[PDB]
Design a protein around this ligand. Sequence first.
Ligand SMILES: COc1cccc(Cl)c1CC(=O)N1CCC[C@H](C(N)=O)C1
Ligand SMILES: [Zn+2]
Length: 139
Amino acid sequence: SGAIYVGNYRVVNRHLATHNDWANLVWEDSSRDLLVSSTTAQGCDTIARCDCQTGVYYCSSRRKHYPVSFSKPSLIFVEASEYYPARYQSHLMLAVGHSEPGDCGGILRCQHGVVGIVSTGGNGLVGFADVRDLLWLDE
Ligand SMILES: COc1cccc(Cl)c1CC(=O)N1CCC[C@H](C(N)=O)C1
Ligand SMILES: [Zn+2]
């Protein structure tokens, strides 16, 4: 679990969104595993606007932060689950690092701010849904 609180927005994995998130929907994209809902309180986080390929992510299944090198946001094949059929997930960045299903929502950050959230994983890899292109989160 985990979310990005920026201004009047809450960014979550679409597959973990709540009834409240869907009742206050701003935008969602199943192909990115992202959903953005509105909030009344002002958000605590800052978003990065960069092409960084190094950062640190929070891994709840180890209660630890890990430094990672990660790929550029791209279309990557993702196996079927109770949430989605087998498909290509866009804007996904892969890194070598530990992750388990409950790790989704963990934040990835670089020196410029929040880069994205854990969305996929498997066999020593971890995938992050990028949010750096969502310029409207700031305005
Ligand atoms: C961090 O996720 C891990 C880690 C290790 C192993 C596994 Cl199966 C996962 C879970 C995972 O990749 N899923 C299930 C939830 C929907 C995801 C998606 N389509 O964006 C795909
Ligand atoms: Zn950066």
